[PDB]
Design a protein around this ligand. Structure first.
Ligand SMILES: CCCCCCCCC(=O)OC[C@H](COP(=O)(O)O[C@@H]1[C@H](O)[C@H](OP(=O)(O)O)[C@@H](O)[C@H](O)[C@H]1O)OC(=O)CCCCCCCC
Ligand SMILES: CCCCCCCCC(=O)OC[C@H](COP(=O)(O)O[C@@H]1[C@H](O)[C@H](OP(=O)(O)O)[C@@H](O)[C@H](O)[C@H]1O)OC(=O)CCCCCCCC
Ligand SMILES: Nc1ncnc2c1ncn2[C@@H]1O[C@H](COP(=O)(O)OP(=O)(O)OP(=O)(O)O)[C@@H](O)[C@H]1O
Ligand SMILES: Nc1ncnc2c1ncn2[C@@H]1O[C@H](COP(=O)(O)OP(=O)(O)OP(=O)(O)O)[C@@H](O)[C@H]1O
Ligand SMILES: *[C@@H]1O[C@H](CO)[C@@H](O[C@@H]2O[C@H](CO)[C@@H](O)[C@H](O)[C@H]2NC(C)=O)[C@H](O)[C@H]1NC(C)=O
Ligand SMILES: *[C@@H]1O[C@H](CO)[C@@H](O[C@@H]2O[C@H](CO)[C@@H](O)[C@H](O)[C@H]2NC(C)=O)[C@H](O)[C@H]1NC(C)=O
Ligand SMILES: *[C@@H]1O[C@H](CO)[C@@H](O)[C@H](O)[C@H]1NC(C)=O
Ligand SMILES: *[C@@H]1O[C@H](CO)[C@@H](O)[C@H](O)[C@H]1NC(C)=O
Ligand SMILES: [Cl-]
Ligand SMILES: [Cl-]
Ligand SMILES: [Cl-]
Ligand SMILES: [Cl-]
Ligand SMILES: [Cl-]
Ligand SMILES: [Cl-]
Ligand SMILES: [Mg+2]
Ligand SMILES: [Mg+2]
Lengths: 218, 683, 683, 218
C-alpha cells in the first residue's frame, strides 16, 4: 500500500513521539507546579521545547500529522498550551531572550521569601506585624511599581494581569497580613467627617428657609 | 403666554411664489433637492462632530477630577484627616457647577434643561424666543460639559437633540445673523417650512448620535411633527440620522486608534442565552411596569412642588447659582458619606473600574459604593445590565437607588444644562436588578431569573414612567439593545407604565411646557370634542382687510396696541385670501402704492426678524393712497364650514401645520378666525 | 379601469353619526378602544398561526419530495438509466404545479401573484373586486404551498402580507358574508375607515412574520397609506406586528420542542469581525448598487415583454395551466442538467445539506450544483451570506445566477401564488459573492474583502432594483441582519440602485398595477403640477342634488346608464353637503319620504354590498313625493377654491384619503368635482 | 505559618501528583495515538482514570487545589480533555459500561483489517478492484448502517459524526479506492438524458409558437 494512508511514514514517527514526550512532561509539570503556582519559572523550558518541536514538524511531516483528520490533536494541544501561556502573561517574567527570568520578578520573589522569613521568624500576633511592617510595605510598593511598569511598557489597558506566580505570592502575603494576622489598622476620622457632612447638608436647608422668609417679609 | 408666536408652515401660494417656481423650473436644471440632501449630510456630520467633542472633553476632565480625588483619598486613608478629601470633592464640584450656572443663568437662561421640550414646542409650531441661536448652542455645550464634570446627577445625551436642531436652523439659512456674516448660498430655504424640516432632521440626528438609534430619532421627529406623511422628507431625516451615527463612530474610532461606538451611551450586547424570556415572564414584566408608573408619577409630582417653589422664591440669577453650587456640594457629600459608611469590599477583576477606590477595605479589594458614585452613570448602567448574578449587595443597591432618585428629582430644574434620560435609566436599572435578585432568591436560583434582564426592563419602565414615550422610545431601546425580541416585553412595560402614570400625573416635558404657559397642541382633541363645533371656537368679530384698502386704515389696525394680530383675512363681504402682518410691513417699507416690481427675495431678506410698525414712517399725503393687495395674498386659504365639528378642525389644523383657519358662512362670508390658542384652551 | 371603485375613508359627520357618538360616549364606559386592541391582537395571532402552518406543511412536503428524488438518483447512479430520475422530478413538479394552477386560474384568478400590489392599491384607496375574500385566502395558502413544493423559483414570504390583510378585513366585521354566518360583535367597525386601519395592521403583521421586522412592516403600512399622522393607529400596528412575530416564534419553538425564529426567512447572525466595513468600502458598495439597478431594470423590462404576450395570447385558463406545468418541468430539467454536467465535488461537513446528493463524485463527497438547485432558496441565501471565503466555485455560481435570474423572470407572471422577494435576494447574493471573490483575488486576499458581506450588499441592491423600496426595505434588512451599522451601506446601495433604475424603467409592482389600468395615486403630483390649477382638473358640468329633491329625479339620475356616480354634492346654487349613492339607495329602500326613524345601524347592516338601482321598486304616486335630505348628508364636505394649485389639491386628497372633492366658486357655488381619476391621469 | 497559604497540605500533595501523572500519560498517548487515529481504543482507560482522579479531588483538597488562583490548571486541563473526548463522539465506540468497545465498532475495524488484507493481497490495479469490490462495498454499507443507527439512537441531528477512528478508517479506505487505485466506474447515460432534456426544453417553445400562430389565424 502507499506509505502514508494506512500507516505512518518512518520519519514522522520520530516527530510524533518527540512531541508526545514533551507534551507529557509539560502537562505533568503544569499540574505539579500549580499549587502554589510555579508555572512560569518551572515550565518555561518545557513550553519552549514543545513550541520548538511543533515548529520542527510544521517546517514534510506537517501534512501527514497536522491536518489529515477531522481533529488535529497536535494542533489543539499546542493551542491549549499557548492559551494557558498567554492567559498567564507569563512573558512578563521572561526577558526578550526567553532564556531566564527578568531581574524584576526575581527581586520580587526574593522579597517574598524575605517577607515570609520575617513572618515565620516572629510567629513564636502583634510581634509579626510590628516587625514585618516594613517588609510587607516594600513588597506592596514593588508590586504596584511593577504593575505600572508593565502597563506603560506593554501599553496595555489598566488592570492587566502579570505573571500568575507574582500575583499568587502577592495574594498569599495579602491574606496573611489582612486576615490570619489582621495587622491592618486604618485610622478613624469619624468626628470631622460627620461634622463637615452635617454642616454641608444643613446649608441648603438654610438657603431655602432664608429665601422663603425673605420673600414673605418682602 | 402671548409672547409665544407661531411658525408659518403653511406656505402662501401667491402670484410671486408661482412666478418664482415657474422660473426655477424653467432653468433647465433643478438644484433645490441636491442642496437639501447636502444640507442634511452637513447637519449629520456636524452633529456627530459635536457629540465627539463633548465625549472627549468629558472623558478627559472627569478622568482628571476623579484621579485627583482618589489620590487625595488614598493619601489620607491611613494618615487620617479624610475630611479634607470631602472638602476637596465638594469644592471642585462647586467650582465647575458655579461656572456652568453663571454662564447659563446670566447670559442665556434659555439654555437651561435638556432642551427637548423646546424642540417639541418648535416642531409643534410654537417659537420660543431664543431656541435656535448660536449663543444657545455654545452655552448648552459648555454647560453640559461643566455639569457632567461637576458631579451632578445629569446626562449629556438629551441636549444633543437641541444642539442638532440649532445646527439645522443655522446652516440652512446660509448666513449668521448673530455674527452679521452672510454667505451667498441657500437663499431659497429662508422660510419656515424648510427650517422646520431641517430642524426635524437635526433632532433625529441628535437622537441617533445619543443612542445610536436612527430609526428611533426618525420616529421621534415624526411623532413631534405629527403632520401629513412626506416620503422624501422622511428619507432625508433617515439619511441625516444615519450619517450622524456613522460620523460619531468613525471619528471616535480614529481618535482612539483602531466600529463599535454607534452612540454616546452604549448599553452593550444582550445576545446571550442568559438574556431570554419565557411566556410565563410576561405577567411579571407588566407588574414591574406598574411600579415604574407609580414611581415615575411620584418623581414628577415632587418636581412639580419643587418647580413652583423655585418659580416663586428662587428666581433671581444669583440665587439660582447658589442653589446649583449647594446641590453639587450636597451630592458630593452624600456620595462620600455613603462610601465611607460602606462595609462591602469586593475583589477587583482588573479594569472593571477606571479608578478603583480602597477605603477601610483589605488590600486587593475595592468599595462598591465608590463604583456606584465614583463612576460615570453610563457605564454604571452598562454594568448593571451586564454583571453576574451575585455581583451586587441588595442593601447598597437600594440605598443608591433611593438617594440617586431623590438627587435626580432635585437636580432636574436647576439653571444648568443637563438631562433626565440617563438618571431615570439608572434608577430603573438599579431597582430592576433588585427585583431580579429578589426573584432569584424566591425562585430557588432559577435560570430564567437573570437580574440583568429585569434591570433592563426596570430601566425601560422608569424611563417610560417619567417621560411617557412608547413608540420611539421602544425603537430606541430595541436598537440600543440590538435585539428585536426584547421589544415585545419592552412595548408592554412601556405601555402599562405610561397608562398607570396618566392616572396620577402628566409627564415631565408636558408639565414643564404647561408651566411655561406655552400653547401646546396635542395629537387629538379632548373627549368632548365631538360635542363642540367651530362656531364657539372661532373668535368674533374678525378684523378683515378689504381687497382695496387705504394705507391709513392699515396703519391704524396694525398699530392698535390692544392686540397684535399677524394675520388678516381679505374681503371684497366675501373672502378672497389672507395676508400676514409681515407682508404688510414689507409692502409699507417699500412704498408699494397705486395712485420697479417686487420679488420674493425681498421678503426672504427680511427673514427671520421683521421691523415693527413704529419704525415705518408714512406722510399724511401718502396715507390717502390705496394698496392693491390682490397680487400679494394667499389666494387659496384653508377654510372650514361654520358648523364643522371640532375634531375635524383640530385634525386639519394639526396635520397641515396651519396658523390661521378662516371660519366662513354659506355665502363665502368671513365669520371667524381660528388659531392655535383657540384650540389649546381645552382639557 | 372604471370597474375599480374607491374606498370611503372620509367619514361623513351627519346628524345620525353625531347622535350615535353622543349616545356611545353617554354610556358611562367606552369599549371601542379595547375592542380595537383585541382585534389587533387576534390579527397578529392568526397571521402568526397561518405562517407556522405554511412553514410546517412546506417543510414536510418538500422534504418528502427531495428524499424521493434523491433516492431515485442514487439508486440509478451506477446501474444507469438516470433519465428516469429526470422524468420523475419533472412529473412531480408538474403535478403539484398543475393542482395549484387549476385552483388559481379557474376558481380565483385574483389569488395569482404575491398579492402585494393588491394591498398597495387597497391602502391607496382603490378596491380590487375580490382581494379580501375568504376564498382568496384559502386559494392563496394552498397555491403557495403547491408552488413552493412544485419546484418553482418562488417564495412564500410576500403572500403572507396579503393573507394578513384578509384576516384583518374579515374578523373586524364580526360576520362571514361568504358563509352567511353572523356573530353579534364588532358592529361598530363595519365601515371603510376601520377596515383600512385593520388592513394596515394586518399587512404590517404579515411583513413582521415574513421577515421578523415589526418596525419594517409598520413603515411599509405607513408609506402605503401615506396619510395624516395617527399616533394611536401606529401604536396598534406596532402592537399587531410584534404579537405576530412573538406568536410565530413561540409556536415554531413548541412544535420543534425546546426563541430563535423571528420570521419565516432568517438571514442569520452577522455579528462578527469578518462582517465589518471601512470608509474605503463606501464607493464600491455604491458601484455595486449601480449594477443592481441595471440588472433590475433588465429583469423588469423582460417581464413587461412577457406580460404583454401573456395578456394577448395566453389568457385562456387552460393555457395558463399548461404554461405553469411546462415552466415547472423546464425548471426541473434545467436543474438536473446543470447538476449532471457539474464536475466540482466537495466534502460534506455533516448536516450542511439536508439531502446531500452524490452523482459522479467520489465517495464522501457531494455536488455543489445540487446544493444550489436541490435545496430551499431561503437557506441557500443564508449559506451564501455565511460561508468561508473558498466555499464556492465562480463558474458554478455564475451559471446558477444566470439561470435562476432568467427562471425567476419567467415565473413571476404565472397564474400561481408566488413571490419575488426571495428569488431577487438570492440572485443578488449570488452575484454579490461573485463580486466579493473577484475583489479578494484582485486585492491579494485582503481581510476587508469578505464575500459574505458583499453578497448581502448585492442581495439588497438587487431587491431594491427590482422592487424599488428604500426606507421600509432598509429597516427590514437591518432587523433581519440584526445589525444597525450595516444600515449605512445598505441605505446607500438601495438609494443608488433605485435612482439608476428609475432612469430606465419603473418597478415591478408599479408596472403590474398600471397594466391592470388601476388608478394609482403617487406620493406627489408631477413636475408640471405647480403650473396647473383645480379648474382644469375638475369635471363639469356637475350633477347636483337639491336639498329639496323629488324621488323621480333622484331615480332618473341614479338609473342613468351613461355613467355611475357614487357621490353627489347638495345644492340650495349654494353647496350644503354631499351624499353618496349608497345613502340614497338605502333611503329609497326604506321609503323615507315626507308628504319610525332611521339609525346608522341600518346603514351598516347593508355593508359592504349594496343593492343596485334596478332592484328598488317605486310606484308612480310615490315618485311625486319629496325627500328631506338635510338630515342624512355630509354637512361639512371638504372643499377647495376654484383657483387652488394642483399640488395643494393632490396633497389634501392623498393625505385625507378623500373620494370626492368639491371645487367651489367665490359665492359657495358648486363649479366642479374632483375624484382620484382626475388626479391620476398625469405623468 | 498556616498550612494552606504558603505551602501545600500533605494530603493534597498526593492528589496533585497522581493527577499530574495521569494527565502526562494521557497526553503522551493522545499525541502518539493520533496518526493513524487511535484515540478511543487506546486512550479510553487513561481518560477514565483522569476523570476518576479529578472526582476524587472534588469529593477536602478541592478548595486548596482547584479554585484558589486566577487560573485553575487542573480545571482547564480536565475540561480540555473532556472537550477532546466529546468533540470525538468517542462514547460511540464505548458501551454504557465504558469498560470495552462495542461489538459494532470492533466489527467495523475488523472488516477494515480484512479489507486492507485484500488490498495488499492483490497489490502485486485492476486486480485489486476486481477482488476487493465486495469487501469495500460491505465496509461502506456497514458505515452507512452505523451512521443511521447512531442518528436514531442518539436522536441527534443529521450529519452528526462518529468515533474519529471509524471515520479515519473509512476515509483511508475511500482514498485508497477512489484515487490511488481509481477503481470507481460510474455508468454513463449521456444520450437518454440529453434527448429527454432537449425534448422537454423544446415543449415550451412549441406551446408559445402554437399559441401565437393560432391567435394570428383566429
Ligand atoms: C464640531 C462643531 C460643529 C458645530 C456647528 C455649529 C454651527 C451651527 C450654529 O450654531 O449656527 C450657525 C450660525 C447661524 O446661527 P445664528 O447665530 O446666526 O442664529 C440665527 C438667529 O439667532 C435667529 O434667531 P431668532 O430666533 O431670533 O430668529 C434664528 O432664528 C436663525 O435661525 C439663526 O440663523 O451661522 C451659520 O449659519 C453658519 C454658516 C452656514 C453656511 C455654510 C453651510 C455649510 C455648513
Ligand atoms: C391559523 C388560521 C387562522 C386564519 C384566520 C382566517 C379568518 C379570516 C378570514 O378569512 O375571514 C373571516 C371571515 C370573513 O370573511 P368573508 O369570507 O365573509 O369576506 C367578506 C366578503 O368577502 C366581502 O367581500 P367584498 O369585497 O365583495 O365586499 C369583504 O369585503 C368583507 O370584508 C368580508 O367580510 O369570517 C369572519 O369574519 C370570522 C368571524 C369573526 C368574529 C370573531 C372575531 C374573533 C377573531
Ligand atoms: N384677524 C383677527 N380678528 C379677530 N381676532 C383675531 C384675529 N387674529 C387673531 N385673533 C384672535 O386674537 C387672539 C390673539 O391672537 P394673536 O394676536 O395671538 O394671533 P397670532 O399671534 O397670529 O397667533 P399665532 O401667532 O399663535 O398664530 C386669539 O384668541 C385669536 O382667536
Ligand atoms: N356628481 C358628478 N357630476 C359630474 N361628474 C362627476 C360626478 N362624479 C364624478 N364625476 C366624474 O365622472 C368621471 C367618472 O366618475 P365615477 O362615476 O368613476 O366616480 P366614482 O366612481 O365615485 O369615483 P371613485 O369611485 O373612484 O371615487 C370622473 O372623471 C369624475 O370626474
Ligand atoms: C538586572 O539588572 C542588574 C542591574 O543592576 C543587572 O546587573 C548586571 O548583571 C550582569 C549579569 O547579567 C553583570 O555582568 C553586571 O556586572 C551587573 N551589573 C551591571 C552594572 O551591569 C542584572 O544582570 C540584571 N539581571 C539579569 C538577569 O540580567
Ligand atoms: C456483540 O453482540 C453479540 C451478539 O451476536 C454478543 O455475543 C455474545 O457475547 C457474549 C459475551 O459478552 C457471549 O457470552 C455469548 O455467548 C454471545 N452470544 C450470545 C447469543 O449471547 C457479543 O458479546 C457482543 N459484544 C460485546 C462486546 O458484548
Ligand atoms: C527537527 O527534527 C529533525 C529530525 O531528526 C532533527 O534533525 C532536527 O535537529 C530537529 N530540529 C530541532 C530544532 O531540534
Ligand atoms: C482517592 O484518594 C484517596 C487518598 O489516598 C484514596 O484513599 C482513594 O482510594 C482514592 N479514590 C479512588 C477512587 O482511587
Ligand atoms: Cl427643559
Ligand atoms: Cl440625558
Ligand atoms: Cl433629557
Ligand atoms: Cl401580483
Ligand atoms: Cl417571496
Ligand atoms: Cl413578493
Ligand atoms: Mg402672537
Ligand atoms: Mg366608480
Amino acid at each position: 500500500l502507499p506509505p502514508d494512508l494506512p500507516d505512518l511514514d518512518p520519519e514522522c514517527r520520530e516527530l510524533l513521539l518527540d512531541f508526545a514526550n514533551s507534551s507529557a512532561e509539560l502537562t505533568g509539570c503544569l499540574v505539579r507546579s500549580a499549587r502554589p503556582v510555579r508555572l512560569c519559572q518551572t515550565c518555561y523550558p518545557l513550553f519552549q521545547q514543545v513550541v520548538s518541536k511543533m515548529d520542527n514538524i510544521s517546517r514534510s511531516c506537517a501534512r501527514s500529522l497536522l491536518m489529515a483528520d477531522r481533529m488535529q490533536i497536535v494542533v489543539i494541544l499546542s493551542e491549549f498550551f499557548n492559551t494557558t501561556w498567554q492567559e498567564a502573561n507569563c512573558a512578563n517574567c521572561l526577558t526578550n531572550n526567553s532564556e531566564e527570568l527578568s531581574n524584576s520578578t526575581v527581586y520580587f520573589l526574593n522579597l517574598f521569601n524575605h517577607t515570609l522569613t520575617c513572618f515565620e521568624h516572629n510567629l513564636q500576633y502583634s510581634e509579626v506585624c510590628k516587625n514585618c511592617r516594613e517588609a510587607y510595605k516594600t513588597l506592596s510598593s514593588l508590586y504596584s511599581e511593577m504593575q505600572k511598569m508593565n502597563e506603560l511598557e506593554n501599553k496595555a489597558e489598566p488592570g492587566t494581569h502579570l505573571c500568575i506566580d507574582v500575583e499568587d505570592a502577592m495574594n498569599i502575603t495579602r491574606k496573611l497580613w489582612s486576615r490570619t494576622f489582621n495587622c491592618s489598622v486604618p485610622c478613624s476620622d469619624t468626628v470631622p467627617v460627620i461634622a463637615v457632612s452635617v454642616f454641608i447638608l444643613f446649608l441648603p436647608v438654610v438657603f431655602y428657609l432664608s429665601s422663603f422668609l425673605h420673600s414673605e417679609q418682602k | 403666554s402671548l409672547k409665544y408666536e407661531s411658525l408659518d408652515y403653511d406656505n402662501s401660494e401667491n402670484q410671486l411664489f408661482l412666478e418664482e417656481e415657474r422660473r426655477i423650473n424653467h432653468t433647465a436644471f433643478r438644484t433645490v433637492e441636491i442642496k437639501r440632501w447636502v444640507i442634511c449630510a452637513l447637519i449629520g456630520i456636524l452633529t456627530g462632530l459635536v457629540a465627539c467633542f463633548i465625549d472627549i472633553v468629558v472623558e478627559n476632565l472627569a478622568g482628571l477630577k476623579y484621579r485627583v480625588i482618589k489620590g487625595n483619598i488614598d493619601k489620607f486613608t491611613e494618615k487620617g484627616g479624610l475630611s479634607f478629601s470631602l472638602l476637596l470633592w465638594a469644592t471642585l464640584n462647586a467650582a465647575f457647577v458655579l461656572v456652568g450656572s453663571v454662564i447659563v443663568a446670566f447670559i442665556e437662561p434659555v439654555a437651561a434643561g435638556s432642551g427637548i421640550p423646546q424642540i417639541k414646542c418648535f416642531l409643534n409650531g410654537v417659537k420660543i424666543p431664543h431656541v435656535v441661536r448660536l449663543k444657545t448652542l455654545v452655552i448648552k455645550v459648555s454647560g453640559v460639559i461643566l455639569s457632567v464634570v461637576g458631579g451632578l446627577a445629569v446626562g449629556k445625551e438629551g441636549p444633543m437633540i437641541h444642539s442638532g436642531s440649532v445646527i439645522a436652523a443655522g446652516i440652512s439659512q446660509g448666513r449668521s445673523t448673530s455674527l452679521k456674516r452672510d454667505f451667498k448660498i441657500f437663499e431659497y430655504f429662508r422660510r419656515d417650512t424648510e427650517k422646520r424640516d431641517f430642524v426635524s432632521a437635526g433632532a433625529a440626528a441628535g437622537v441617533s448620535a445619543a443612542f445610536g438609534a436612527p430609526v428611533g430619532g426618525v420616529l421621534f421627529s415624526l411623532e413631534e411633527g405629527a403632520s401629513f406623511w412626506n416620503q422624501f422628507l422622511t428619507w432625508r431625516i433617515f439619511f441625516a440620522s444615519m450619517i450622524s451615527t456613522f460620523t460619531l463612530n468613525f471619528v471616535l474610532s480614529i481618535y482612539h486608534g483602531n466600529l463599535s461606538s454607534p452612540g454616546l451611551i452604549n448599553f452593550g450586547r444582550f445576545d446571550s442565552e442568559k438574556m431570554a424570556y419565557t411566556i410565563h415572564e410576561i405577567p411579571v414584566f407588566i407588574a414591574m411596569g406598574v411600579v415604574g408608573g407609580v414611581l415615575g408619577a411620584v418623581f414628577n409630582a415632587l418636581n412639580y412642588w419643587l418647580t413652583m417653589f423655585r418659580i416663586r422664591y428662587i428666581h433671581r440669577p444669583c440665587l439660582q447659582v447658589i442653589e446649583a453650587v449647594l446641590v453639587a456640594a450636597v451630592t458630593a457629600t452624600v456620595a462620600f458619606v455613603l462610601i465611607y459608611s460602606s462595609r462591602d469590599c469586593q475583589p477587583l477583576q482588573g479594569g472593571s473600574m477606571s479608578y478603583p477606590l480602597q477605603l477601610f477595605c483589605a488590600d486587593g479589594e475595592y468599595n462598591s459604593m465608590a463604583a456606584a458614585f465614583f463612576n460615570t452613570p453610563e457605564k454604571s448602567v452598562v454594568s448593571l445590565f451586564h454583571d453576574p448574578p451575585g455581583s451586587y449587595n441588595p442593601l447598597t443597591l437600594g440605598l443608591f437607588t433611593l438617594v440617586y432618585f431623590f438627587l435626580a428629582c432635585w437636580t432636574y430644574g436647576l439653571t444648568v444644562s443637563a438631562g433626565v434620560f440617563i438618571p431615570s435609566l439608572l434608577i430603573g436599572a438599579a431597582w430592576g436588578r433588585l427585583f431580579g435578585i429578589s426573584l432569584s432568591y424566591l425562585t430557588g436560583a432559577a435560570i430564567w431569573a437573570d437580574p440583568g434582564k429585569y434591570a433592563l426592563m426596570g430601566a425601560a419602565a422608569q424611563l417610560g414612567g417619567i417621560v411617557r414615550m412608547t413608540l420611539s422610545l421602544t425603537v430606541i431601546m430595541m436598537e440600543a439593545t440590538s435585539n428585536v425580541t426584547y421589544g415585545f416585553p419592552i412595548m408592554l412595560v412601556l405601555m402599562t407604565a405610561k397608562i398607570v402614570g396618566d392616572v396620577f400625573i402628566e409627564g415631565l416635558y408636558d408639565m414643564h411646557i404647561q408651566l411655561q404657559s406655552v400653547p401646546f397642541l396635542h395629537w387629538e382633541a379632548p373627549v368632548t370634542s365631538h360635542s363642540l363645533t367651530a362656531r364657539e371656537v372661532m373668535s368674533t368679530p374678525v378684523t378683515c382687510l378689504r381687497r382695496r384698502e387705504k394705507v391709513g386704515v392699515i396703519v391704524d389696525v396694525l398699530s392698535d396696541t390692544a392686540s397684535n394680530h399677524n394675520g388678516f383675512p381679505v374681503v371684497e363681504a366675501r373672502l378672497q385670501g389672507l395676508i400676514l402682518r409681515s407682508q404688510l410691513i414689507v409692502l409699507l417699507k417699500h412704498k408699494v402704492f397705486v395712485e420697479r416690481r417686487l420679488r420674493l427675495k425681498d421678503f426672504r431678506d427680511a427673514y427671520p426678524r421683521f421691523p415693527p410698525i413704529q419704525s415705518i414712517h408714512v406722510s399724511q399725503d401718502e396715507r390717502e393712497c390705496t394698496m392693491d393687495l390682490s397680487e400679494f395674498m394667499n389666494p387659496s386659504p384653508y377654510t372650514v364650514p361654520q358648523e364643522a365639528s371640532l375634531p375635524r378642525v383640530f385634525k386639519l389644523f394639526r396635520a397641515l401645520g396651519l396658523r390661521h383657519l378662516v371660519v366662513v358662512d354659506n355665502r363665502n362670508q368671513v365669520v371667524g378666525l381660528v388659531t392655535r390658542k383657540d384650540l389649546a384652551r381645552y382639557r
